[PDB]
Design an enzyme around this catalytic site. Structure first.
Site, PDB file in Angstrom:
ATOM      1  N   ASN A 111     -15.352  -2.455  -0.437  1.00  0.00           N
ATOM      2  CA  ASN A 111     -15.498  -1.592   0.726  1.00  0.00           C
ATOM      3  C   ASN A 111     -16.096  -2.384   1.908  1.00  0.00           C
ATOM      4  OD1 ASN A 111     -16.145   1.426  -1.286  1.00  0.00           O
ATOM      5  ND2 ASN A 111     -14.183   0.528  -0.607  1.00  0.00           N
ATOM      6  N   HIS A 142     -18.744   0.589  -7.737  1.00  0.00           N
ATOM      7  CA  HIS A 142     -19.280   1.939  -7.993  1.00  0.00           C
ATOM      8  C   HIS A 142     -20.504   1.905  -8.917  1.00  0.00           C
ATOM      9  CE1 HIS A 142     -15.084   3.902  -7.038  1.00  0.00           C
ATOM     10  NE2 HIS A 142     -15.693   3.473  -5.955  1.00  0.00           N
ATOM     11  N   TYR A 146     -10.972  -2.980  -7.445  1.00  0.00           N
ATOM     12  CA  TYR A 146     -11.776  -3.318  -6.236  1.00  0.00           C
ATOM     13  C   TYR A 146     -11.961  -4.798  -5.952  1.00  0.00           C
ATOM     14  CZ  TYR A 146     -12.656   1.657  -5.696  1.00  0.00           C
ATOM     15  OH  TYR A 146     -12.495   3.008  -5.587  1.00  0.00           O
ATOM     16  N   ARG A 193     -10.122   3.242 -13.072  1.00  0.00           N
ATOM     17  CA  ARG A 193      -9.213   4.395 -13.010  1.00  0.00           C
ATOM     18  C   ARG A 193      -7.760   4.104 -12.530  1.00  0.00           C
ATOM     19  NH1 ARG A 193     -11.763   5.024  -7.799  1.00  0.00           N
ATOM     20  NH2 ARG A 193     -10.405   6.024  -6.277  1.00  0.00           N
TER      21      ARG A 193
HETATM   22  C1  LIG Z   1     -16.539  11.824  -4.559  1.00  0.00           C
HETATM   23  C2  LIG Z   1     -17.215  10.982  -3.507  1.00  0.00           C
HETATM   24  O1  LIG Z   1     -17.239  11.323  -2.321  1.00  0.00           O
HETATM   25  N1  LIG Z   1     -17.788   9.808  -4.044  1.00  0.00           N
HETATM   26  C3  LIG Z   1     -18.528   8.795  -3.186  1.00  0.00           C
HETATM   27  C4  LIG Z   1     -17.747   7.430  -3.125  1.00  0.00           C
HETATM   28  O2  LIG Z   1     -16.426   7.630  -2.540  1.00  0.00           O
HETATM   29  C5  LIG Z   1     -15.337   7.127  -3.286  1.00  0.00           C
HETATM   30  O3  LIG Z   1     -15.110   5.750  -2.882  1.00  0.00           O
HETATM   31  C6  LIG Z   1     -13.971   4.928  -3.510  1.00  0.00           C
HETATM   32  C7  LIG Z   1     -13.918   3.630  -3.040  1.00  0.00           C
HETATM   33  O4  LIG Z   1     -13.059   3.401  -2.156  1.00  0.00           O
HETATM   34  O5  LIG Z   1     -14.745   2.853  -3.576  1.00  0.00           O
HETATM   35  C8  LIG Z   1     -12.657   5.938  -3.377  1.00  0.00           C
HETATM   36  O6  LIG Z   1     -11.575   5.145  -3.984  1.00  0.00           O
HETATM   37  C9  LIG Z   1     -10.295   5.130  -3.340  1.00  0.00           C
HETATM   38  O7  LIG Z   1      -9.706   6.533  -3.336  1.00  0.00           O
HETATM   39  C10 LIG Z   1      -8.370   6.605  -2.670  1.00  0.00           C
HETATM   40  C11 LIG Z   1      -7.889   8.081  -2.724  1.00  0.00           C
HETATM   41  O8  LIG Z   1      -6.602   8.309  -2.108  1.00  0.00           O
HETATM   42  C12 LIG Z   1      -7.354   5.599  -3.339  1.00  0.00           C
HETATM   43  O9  LIG Z   1      -6.087   5.692  -2.642  1.00  0.00           O
HETATM   44  C13 LIG Z   1      -7.956   4.166  -3.249  1.00  0.00           C
HETATM   45  O10 LIG Z   1      -7.032   3.184  -3.807  1.00  0.00           O
HETATM   46  C14 LIG Z   1      -6.451   2.385  -2.773  1.00  0.00           C
HETATM   47  O11 LIG Z   1      -5.669   3.277  -1.888  1.00  0.00           O
HETATM   48  C15 LIG Z   1      -4.935   2.719  -0.658  1.00  0.00           C
HETATM   49  C16 LIG Z   1      -4.253   3.657   0.068  1.00  0.00           C
HETATM   50  O12 LIG Z   1      -3.213   4.074  -0.488  1.00  0.00           O
HETATM   51  O13 LIG Z   1      -4.741   3.947   1.180  1.00  0.00           O
HETATM   52  C17 LIG Z   1      -4.113   1.438  -1.245  1.00  0.00           C
HETATM   53  O14 LIG Z   1      -3.481   0.943   0.000  1.00  0.00           O
HETATM   54  C18 LIG Z   1      -2.629  -0.187   0.179  1.00  0.00           C
HETATM   55  O15 LIG Z   1      -3.344  -1.463  -0.195  1.00  0.00           O
HETATM   56  C19 LIG Z   1      -2.512  -2.685   0.028  1.00  0.00           C
HETATM   57  C20 LIG Z   1      -3.354  -3.905  -0.441  1.00  0.00           C
HETATM   58  O16 LIG Z   1      -3.643  -4.900   0.565  1.00  0.00           O
HETATM   59  C21 LIG Z   1      -2.106  -2.768   1.570  1.00  0.00           C
HETATM   60  O17 LIG Z   1      -1.313  -3.960   1.760  1.00  0.00           O
HETATM   61  C22 LIG Z   1      -1.280  -1.480   1.939  1.00  0.00           C
HETATM   62  O18 LIG Z   1      -0.902  -1.472   3.363  1.00  0.00           O
HETATM   63  C23 LIG Z   1       0.266  -2.144   3.835  1.00  0.00           C
HETATM   64  O19 LIG Z   1       0.189  -3.595   3.748  1.00  0.00           O
HETATM   65  C24 LIG Z   1       1.437  -4.357   4.246  1.00  0.00           C
HETATM   66  C25 LIG Z   1       1.132  -5.760   4.020  1.00  0.00           C
HETATM   67  O20 LIG Z   1       1.559  -6.225   2.920  1.00  0.00           O
HETATM   68  O21 LIG Z   1       0.480  -6.341   4.952  1.00  0.00           O
HETATM   69  C26 LIG Z   1       2.200  -3.956   5.298  1.00  0.00           C
HETATM   70  O22 LIG Z   1       2.689  -4.690   5.897  1.00  0.00           O
HETATM   71  C27 LIG Z   1       1.620  -2.665   5.746  1.00  0.00           C
HETATM   72  O23 LIG Z   1       1.673  -2.539   7.188  1.00  0.00           O
HETATM   73  C28 LIG Z   1       0.370  -1.893   5.316  1.00  0.00           C
HETATM   74  O24 LIG Z   1       0.483  -0.505   5.564  1.00  0.00           O
HETATM   75  C29 LIG Z   1      -2.204  -0.246   1.686  1.00  0.00           C
HETATM   76  N2  LIG Z   1      -1.497   1.053   2.039  1.00  0.00           N
HETATM   77  C30 LIG Z   1      -0.249   1.460   1.512  1.00  0.00           C
HETATM   78  C31 LIG Z   1       0.177   2.799   2.047  1.00  0.00           C
HETATM   79  O25 LIG Z   1       0.448   0.829   0.703  1.00  0.00           O
HETATM   80  C32 LIG Z   1      -4.994   0.451  -2.091  1.00  0.00           C
HETATM   81  O26 LIG Z   1      -4.175  -0.632  -2.578  1.00  0.00           O
HETATM   82  C33 LIG Z   1      -5.548   1.246  -3.323  1.00  0.00           C
HETATM   83  O27 LIG Z   1      -6.363   0.380  -4.159  1.00  0.00           O
HETATM   84  C34 LIG Z   1      -9.307   4.147  -4.047  1.00  0.00           C
HETATM   85  N3  LIG Z   1      -9.919   2.773  -4.041  1.00  0.00           N
HETATM   86  C35 LIG Z   1      -9.710   1.891  -5.117  1.00  0.00           C
HETATM   87  C36 LIG Z   1     -10.405   0.568  -4.927  1.00  0.00           C
HETATM   88  O28 LIG Z   1      -9.032   2.143  -6.118  1.00  0.00           O
HETATM   89  C37 LIG Z   1     -12.904   7.373  -3.962  1.00  0.00           C
HETATM   90  O29 LIG Z   1     -11.717   8.197  -3.817  1.00  0.00           O
HETATM   91  C38 LIG Z   1     -14.066   7.997  -3.124  1.00  0.00           C
HETATM   92  O30 LIG Z   1     -14.368   9.335  -3.565  1.00  0.00           O
HETATM   93  C39 LIG Z   1     -18.552   6.445  -2.220  1.00  0.00           C
HETATM   94  O31 LIG Z   1     -17.885   5.160  -2.117  1.00  0.00           O
HETATM   95  C40 LIG Z   1     -19.984   6.220  -2.863  1.00  0.00           C
HETATM   96  C41 LIG Z   1     -20.862   5.282  -2.016  1.00  0.00           C
HETATM   97  O32 LIG Z   1     -20.484   3.897  -2.113  1.00  0.00           O
HETATM   98  O33 LIG Z   1     -20.708   7.523  -2.995  1.00  0.00           O
HETATM   99  C42 LIG Z   1     -19.931   8.526  -3.817  1.00  0.00           C
HETATM  100  O34 LIG Z   1     -20.680   9.718  -3.889  1.00  0.00           O
END
Ligand SMILES: CC(=O)N[C@@H]1[C@@H](O[C@@H]2O[C@H](C(=O)O)[C@@H](O[C@@H]3O[C@H](CO)[C@@H](O)[C@H](O[C@@H]4O[C@H](C(=O)O)[C@@H](O[C@@H]5O[C@H](CO)[C@@H](O)[C@H](O[C@@H]6O[C@H](C(=O)O)[C@H](O)[C@H](O)[C@H]6O)[C@H]5NC(C)=O)[C@H](O)[C@H]4O)[C@H]3NC(C)=O)[C@H](O)[C@H]2O)[C@H](O)[C@@H](CO)O[C@H]1O
Length: 721
Positions: free
Chosen positions: A180, A230, A239, A293
């Site tokens: 993050n 996490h 991550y 997950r």
């Molecule tokens: C309940 C609560 O509030 N708890 C909090 C806690 O919050 C939680 O935090 C985590 C966290 O992030 O640590 C959350 O986890 C994430 O949840 C989302 C839910 O939808 C998941 O989707 C996410 O997993 C990631 O999702 C992305 C996404 O789809 O947006 C994925 O995206 C793609 O990644 C590619 C890798 O680089 C990227 O390339 C791609 O974009 C394209 O790239 C091209 C390129 O090659 O350059 C190109 O040209 C393009 O232009 C470009 O668009 C990108 N997007 C797409 C559409 O493909 C990503 O890969 C995937 O991993 C998930 N995170 C993980 C790591 O799995 C959780 O949901 C929250 O609740 C707080 O963090 C905490 C405090 O720290 O407190 C708690 O209480």
């Protein structure tokens, strides 16, 4: 208005889309361009048109599910790619340009601005949506004014003001740490450029640089190559991926700013690759036990998730020089060539990445040599990864402890991961598809391989737990030999077991003692649950005589051996029982859907055949004891079980030990401080985990105290006779 900020953004465009690189004669690039043409076409024929509307796309219309904010903006971003690509049919198309503009404005005014609060989940408001907005503006900067760009990014500054802290506007602010921190980096550096803001760029950079520190606790990388996120979850492979993916996209940009990144910290990234990521990568597969997950996503099976790491590594190479560039190029090339199962190009999504991969694969200066044998003990996240290059299998051992969470069930993903860290083992052999093709929705989550459990029903709404015991970890001797234990208590404190594993080069012994059950439920250890291929039938042997397996479980009392024979040796699996044991086996069709394990996924029914081997534990003080011997033929397996007939040294409530007389190695687990004498040759003295080799008259000694997380001086733990 053009200046150094937009020169930087031209470089960004080249990284995120890479239209300058596009070549219609290039087969792989053309396929990607065709995918994007089709995406833009479905968006365009789909969009709500006419008098002002409640949504842009119907399938993404509930603006209270936040995944629909980012999904909406990602459609506009595709349009932006295609609108700035000269070989697209949508190149400078007047409808696409007006559509992206009115859609940015429509969202700004009805769905996503500074007067909004987070509804649903925060990653969407702070990371996914911002990145999609930044990428759209940047691709399309020559169609927006500076004042519009500032208008459309003010919201990014509200939700993400601070280089450092994440979620600050909520009633629950935090520490953006680990991946993050890098995801923040991409958000803030790019809005920084977009908004022509020097303080925002430099302080965001200074702030990403803390990702280069090794930590002793919490999230980040550890000196033994573990990665935590996490708070307490083994996470290198989801991550950790984000962190390498994201940093490797940003660095060519960061390196041309006023505030570049000291090239001594490049050496820390290289270390992450060699120590942390590389051991997790087997035949092109990223081990599931590190992906938390994400194992529950149909679109992210192991070979697909691996590419995120590989393209990051291949980007790092391209900004390196000399020997280090060439070595990282070879790492990538040898992994990609080992993979007969998945086509890498299916997860390369920019032209620049496709280009970089094509040149690496066809440059004969870049060596593609089979990886050598290794054994990584990731004690700081309670995992072990082993690989034998001679016979060609990998082995993954997924534990947890007081210091770590068993499984991650969050945002409705991974609903049945209960037992994925209860001593579960993984075996990577010549079936590269094994953990793919719908393994996760189809595996019986009550019988995860290597786990000792009761048959109580479990609830999907359950969340993860830490283990009561700290007595969990691995003592590594060399790259072929280690030992582990887990002082196991099940999730509701009715079953226990001393579970130990002895990694002896070309085989692993599984020992379990002190098995006790105070529930009314039945208890058993799952020796195996292997997904089968119709193309490759196993012939099954029990005690070296053919067995025929059925849906209904059959009993095999007085078992010394089981052997799964394929026409391909690299798929063979033997189990040798040191003492005759009473086991059961079946071969059955198992069905389920990905939705069953992750609310967001398809409900479409999937099926696979599985073979299950289990051993019932009917009495307190029960015991198991066997040697997994992969990747050899039947005659070789029969010879090894003769070599190993006296290899079990002890399997009781305070002492567990196996000896390999061919290597001259002992693995040993001690639960107390007594004096144990081993094979009439030496004595071990301390509670802990030991791997010992005899070389002539001397002993090489690897001792590990899992509770304190400390080795020890030799004379405290060992004495020759
Ligand atoms: C309940 C609560 O509030 N708890 C909090 C806690 O919050 C939680 O935090 C985590 C966290 O992030 O640590 C959350 O986890 C994430 O949840 C989302 C839910 O939808 C998941 O989707 C996410 O997993 C990631 O999702 C992305 C996404 O789809 O947006 C994925 O995206 C793609 O990644 C590619 C890798 O680089 C990227 O390339 C791609 O974009 C394209 O790239 C091209 C390129 O090659 O350059 C190109 O040209 C393009 O232009 C470009 O668009 C990108 N997007 C797409 C559409 O493909 C990503 O890969 C995937 O991993 C998930 N995170 C993980 C790591 O799995 C959780 O949901 C929250 O609740 C707080 O963090 C905490 C405090 O720290 O407190 C708690 O209480």
């Amino acid at each position: 208005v053009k200046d150094t900020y937009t020169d930087r953004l031209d470089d960004w465009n080249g990284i995120i889309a890479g239209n300058q690189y596009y070549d219609s004669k290039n087969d792989q690039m053309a396929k990607l361009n065709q995918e994007l043409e089709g995406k833009v076409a479905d968006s365009l024929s789909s969009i709500s048109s006419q008098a002002d509307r409640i949504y842009l796309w119907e399938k993404f219309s509930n603006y209270k599910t936040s995944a629909n904010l980012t999904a909406t903006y990602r459609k506009l971003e595709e349009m932006a790619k295609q609108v700035t690509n000269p070989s697209s049919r949508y190149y400078q198309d007047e409808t696409v340009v007006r559509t992206v503009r009115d859609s940015m404005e429509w969202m700004h005014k009805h769905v996503y601005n500074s007067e909004k609060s987070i509804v649903g989940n925060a990653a969407d408001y702070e990371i996914g949506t911002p990145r999609a907005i930044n990428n759209t503006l940047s691709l399309m900067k020559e169609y927006f004014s500076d004042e519009e760009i500032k208008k459309y990014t003010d919201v990014i500054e509200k939700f993400v003001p601070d280089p450092e802290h994440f979620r600050k506007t909520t009633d629950n602010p935090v520490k953006a740490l680990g991946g993050n921190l890098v995801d923040m980096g991409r958000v803030k550096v790019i809005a920084g450029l977009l908004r022509k803001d020097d303080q925002e760029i430099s302080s965001t950079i200074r702030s990403i640089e803390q990702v280069f520190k090794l930590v002793d606790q919490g999230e980040g990388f550890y000196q033994d190559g573990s990665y935590i996120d996490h708070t307490n979850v083994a996470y290198t492979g989801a991550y950790g991926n984000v962190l390498i993916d994201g940093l490797s996209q940003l660095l060519p940009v960061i390196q041309k700013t006023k505030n570049p990144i000291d090239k001594d910290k490049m050496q820390t990234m290289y270390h992450w690759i060699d120590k942390s990521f590389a051991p997790l990568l087997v035949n092109g597969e990223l081990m599931d036990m590190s992906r938390g997950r994400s194992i529950s996503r149909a679109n992210s099976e192991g070979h697909v998730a691996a590419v995120e790491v590989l393209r990051g590594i291949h980007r790092i190479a391209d900004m390196s020089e000399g020997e280090t560039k060439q070595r990282l190029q070879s790492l990538v090339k040898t992994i990609v060539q080992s993979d007969s199962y998945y086509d890498v190009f299916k997860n390369l999504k920019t032209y620049k990445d496709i280009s970089l991969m094509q040149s690496l694969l066809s440059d004969a200066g870049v060596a593609s040599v089979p990886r050598t044998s290794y054994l990584s003990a990731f004690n700081k996240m309670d995992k072990t990864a082993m690989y034998n290059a001679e016979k060609g299998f990998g082995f993954g051992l997924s534990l947890f402890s007081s210091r770590t969470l068993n499984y991650e069930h969050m945002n409705k993903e991974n609903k049945r991961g209960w037992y994925t860290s209860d001593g579960m083992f993984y075996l990577y052999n010549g079936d590269l598809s094994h953990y793919s093709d719908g393994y996760w929705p189809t595996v019986n989550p009550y019988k995860m391989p290597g786990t000792t459990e009761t048959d109580a029903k479990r609830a999907d709404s359950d969340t993860g737990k830490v283990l009561p015991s700290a007595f969990v970890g691995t003592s590594k001797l060399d790259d072929a030999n280690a030992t582990a234990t887990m002082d196991f208590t099940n999730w509701n404190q009715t079953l226990t077991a001393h579970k130990s594993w002895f990694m002896l080069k070309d085989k692993i012994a599984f020992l379990g003692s002190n098995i006790q059950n105070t529930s009314t439920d039945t208890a058993a250890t799952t020796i195996d649950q292997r997904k089968l291929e119709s193309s490759n039938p196993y012939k099954v042997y029990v005690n070296d005589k053919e067995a025929s397996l059925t849906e209904q479980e059959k009993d095999y009392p007085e078992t010394q051996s089981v052997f799964l024979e394929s026409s391909d040796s690299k798929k063979n699996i033997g189990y040798f029982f040191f003492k005759k044991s009473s086991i059961s086996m079946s071969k059955a069709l198992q069905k389920g859907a990905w939705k069953d394990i992750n609310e967001g996924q398809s409900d479409k029914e999937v099926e696979n055949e599985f073979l299950t081997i289990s051993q019932a534990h009917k009495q307190n003080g029960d015991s198991y004891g066997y040697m997994l011997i992969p990747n050899v033929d039947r005659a070789t397996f029969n010879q090894m079980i003769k070599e190993l007939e006296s290899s079990l040294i002890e399997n009781n409530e305070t002492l567990q030990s196996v000896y390999d007389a061919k290597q001259g190695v002992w693995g040993i687990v001690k639960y107390d401080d007594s004096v144990s004498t081993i094979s009439n040759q030496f004595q071990v003295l301390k509670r802990g985990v030991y791997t010992i080799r005899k070389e002539g008259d001397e002993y090489k000694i690897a001792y590990y105290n899992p509770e304190t997380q400390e080795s020890a001086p030799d004379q405290e733990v060992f004495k020759k006779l």
